[PDB]
């Protein structure tokens, strides 16, 4: 009842809201502060072939005023557990190799800062360096700092030495314009601000990266407990949301694994509730989920309506030709008049409108994958992933910033690809509950900036969504919002407007960004990048419909309406395709009626007015089915 609640000076007592925020601001910064329980991760990437980025760390650690210049000798380590006295911070500085492009992309897929080298002398590489900036920039950067490091920033130019700073600031903004200036490392306090910013500025979170616990391995070793498999020993700092023993875990270029125990530096093993290295397989649980929909050959009338090296380059010229013509007359199959148009079009189903009609979700298909019932069905994906992240909070045994020796069930088959954790970056990413097992997913492709070559619809494309990377032959569709969730299949991909791919792959629960590429092993750096995109959701009900358009000409007008030239060939073509209506190019609708077919001609009926030297087109629709996918290592 009492509702004055006015005229108060204790408003100042709403400084307690300023103490809760400062309290959380300190409770953010327990993890990164101290000689104990702390590490930053920094990566130095030269965007030129030049520079040999050792010297970036040389210039950048002159301003420590310590004995951290004793490490960084000519002795090559590439990961440095450097503490700085002057800022009470401890850094894990990484330099990846310039050859392995995937080392670069999988480095900043762990990092917290990405210090970019630039050059005064040699321009930024268009085909390699720019691709580094774009690709890091689309997989997600925690934080990022620009650096000019040439002596010839002065030594070339006593010609008012700065002006290259406008070119590199100005160049450097065009990717990420949250950066005002590009720091010089050839003067003192400029380098100091770089060092400060590394030490004490917070890096932001990356949502998929921090909703999965992950370590950076400081020591790897293998323990035999089995004659082929065994146990690993991995020492590192937990930085993500954390770990539980009952999850799996993931390593890039090795795949998914199942860890055994976790040491804390209380030890937990993995009990009953741990998940396995399969899909939702079980080989008898399919036929408990029984289905109905049969499009048999019952009815020799009545299509389904429910009435109301140089040879591959010649293949490339074939793909450019088929996309070139498939632009101009899209979905228009060209019947051979010699061959009967019945056998070709047996499985097709004609529709008034895709958007309005309703399919029962599957059918007695048999061009589906038989593992269709071996797929995890999802309700509301939002009401899946917030629940799973909710269980990940409440059941994380490993708080971040804790040192862990990690015990992973691991084969002796795979020790021969392991390197030491100094010259490279064996780093281990956690997973979530159902992030191992297969369901029908959806991405959202868009083309790369330089890229203009055509992409067909089921050629294989490597997809890096989050950390894992699969080899995927996709299914493309334009983005639209039909209520039945039934969308038109694409045979090639658009010039610019963002489409949707679809395939079968195991699920992400974080909607990670994705880069799409094909491997280019003969070419330059090991990848010709195709596109970038974002994991939309896991929808099994995303029904793509293959559209095939049969096209005819009229001969003689004014009588009923119109006849047929090129549409059909036989009077067998009547009975299948003449309950199915028909469209034209700002015209009429429906119901061709029979005549001769002995030469070619089918005397059509319509609804409307205008007819001239024009075309006449009908349609038939068929579901496309997803293809299963494999990892890429």
């Amino acid at each position: 009842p009492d509702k004055q609640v006015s005229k108060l000076q204790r408003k100042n007592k709403a400084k307690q809201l300023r103490a809760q925020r400062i309290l959380d601001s300190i409770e953010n910064r327990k993890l990164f502060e101290g000689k104990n329980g702390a590490a930053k991760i920094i990566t130095i990437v030269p965007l030129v072939n030049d520079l040999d980025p050792l010297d970036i760390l040389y210039k950048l650690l002159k301003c420590a005023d310590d004995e951290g210049i004793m490490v960084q000798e000519v002795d090559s380590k590439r990961i440095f557990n450097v503490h700085i006295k002057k800022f009470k911070s401890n850094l894990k500085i990484i330099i990846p190799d310039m050859t392995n492009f995937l080392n670069i992309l999988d480095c900043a897929k762990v990092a917290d800062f990405v210090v970019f080298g630039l050059s005064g002398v040699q321009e930024v590489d268009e085909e390699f360096g720019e691709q580094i900036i774009r690709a890091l920039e689309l997989q997600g950067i925690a934080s990022y700092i620009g650096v000019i490091s040439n002596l010839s920033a002065v030594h070339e130019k006593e010609k008012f030495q700065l002006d290259v700073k406008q070119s590199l600031e100005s160049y450097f903004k065009h990717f990420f314009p949250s950066e005002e200036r590009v720091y010089n490392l050839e003067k003192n306090s400029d380098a100091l601000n770089v060092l400060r910013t590394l030490c004490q500025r917070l890096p932001r979170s990356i949502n998929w990266r921090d909703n999965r616990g992950y370590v950076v391995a400081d020591f790897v070793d293998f323990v035999e407990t089995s004659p082929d498999s065994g146990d690993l020993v991995i020492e590192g700092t937990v930085r993500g949301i954390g770990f539980n023993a009952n999850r799996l875990v993931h390593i890039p270029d090795f795949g998914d694994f199942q860890l055994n125990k976790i040491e804390k530096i209380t030890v937990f093993e993995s009990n009953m509730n741990r998940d396995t290295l399969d899909e939702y397989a079980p080989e008898g649980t399919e036929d408990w989920s029984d289905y109905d929909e049969d499009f048999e050959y019952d009815g020799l009338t009545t299509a389904r309506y429910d009435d109301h090296p140089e040879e591959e380059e010649r293949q490339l010229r074939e793909f450019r030709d088929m996309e070139k013509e498939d632009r101009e007359f899209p979905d228009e199959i060209e019947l051979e008049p010699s061959e009967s148009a019945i056998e070709r079009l047996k499985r097709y189903r004609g529709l008034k409108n895709l958007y309005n009609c309703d399919w029962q979700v599957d059918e007695k298909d048999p061009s589906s994958p038989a593992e269709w019932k071996r797929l995890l069905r999802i309700g509301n994906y939002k009401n899946t992933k917030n629940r799973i992240i909710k269980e990940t909070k409440n059941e994380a045994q490993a708080i971040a910033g804790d040192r862990i020796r990690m015990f992973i069930r691991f084969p002796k088959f795979l020790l021969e690809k392991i390197q030491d954790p100094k010259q490279l970056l064996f780093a281990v990413y956690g997973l979530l509950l159902h992030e191992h097992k297969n369901a029908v997913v959806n991405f959202s492709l868009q083309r790369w900036e330089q890229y203009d070559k055509p992409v067909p619809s089921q050629e294989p494309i490597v997809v890096q969504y989050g950390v894992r990377r699969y080899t995927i032959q996709p299914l493309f569709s334009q983005g639209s919002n039909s209520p039945n969730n039934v969308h038109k299949y694409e045979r090639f991909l658009h010039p610019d407007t963002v489409s949707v791919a679809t395939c079968i792959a195991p699920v992400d629960f974080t909607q990670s960004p994705a880069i799409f590429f094909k491997p280019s092993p003969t070419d330059a750096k090991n990848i010709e990048l195709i596109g970038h995109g974002t994991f939309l959701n896991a929808d099994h009900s995303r029904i793509l419909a293959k559209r095939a358009i049969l096209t005819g000409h009229p001969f003689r007008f004014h009588k009923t309406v119109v006849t047929v030239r090129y549409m059909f060939f036989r009077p067998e073509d009547v009975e299948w395709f003449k309950s199915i209506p028909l469209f034209t190019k700002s015209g009429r609708s429906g119901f061709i009626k029979e005549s001769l077919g002995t030469h070619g001609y089918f005397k059509a009926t319509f609804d409307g007015k205008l007819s001239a030297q024009d075309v006449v087109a009908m349609s038939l629709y068929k579901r496309m089915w997803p293809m299963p996918s494999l990892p890429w290592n």
Partner: protein
């Protein structure tokens, strides 16, 4: 989702641009990268 947008109102002191039932603020800048310039393809947008 979970990005950093800068808001400003439409220009009516709140209510509408038009038919819109109860939406009053427009987004000016995502991730500090200025939707005008992205829409005109002058900068790029890094993720987070």
């Amino acid at each position: 989702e979970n990005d950093e947008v800068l808001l400003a109102g439409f220009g009516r002191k709140g209510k509408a641009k038009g038919d819109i039932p109860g939406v009053r603020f427009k987004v000016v800048k995502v991730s500090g990268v200025s939707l005008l310039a992205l829409w005109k393809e002058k900068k790029e947008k890094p993720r987070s």
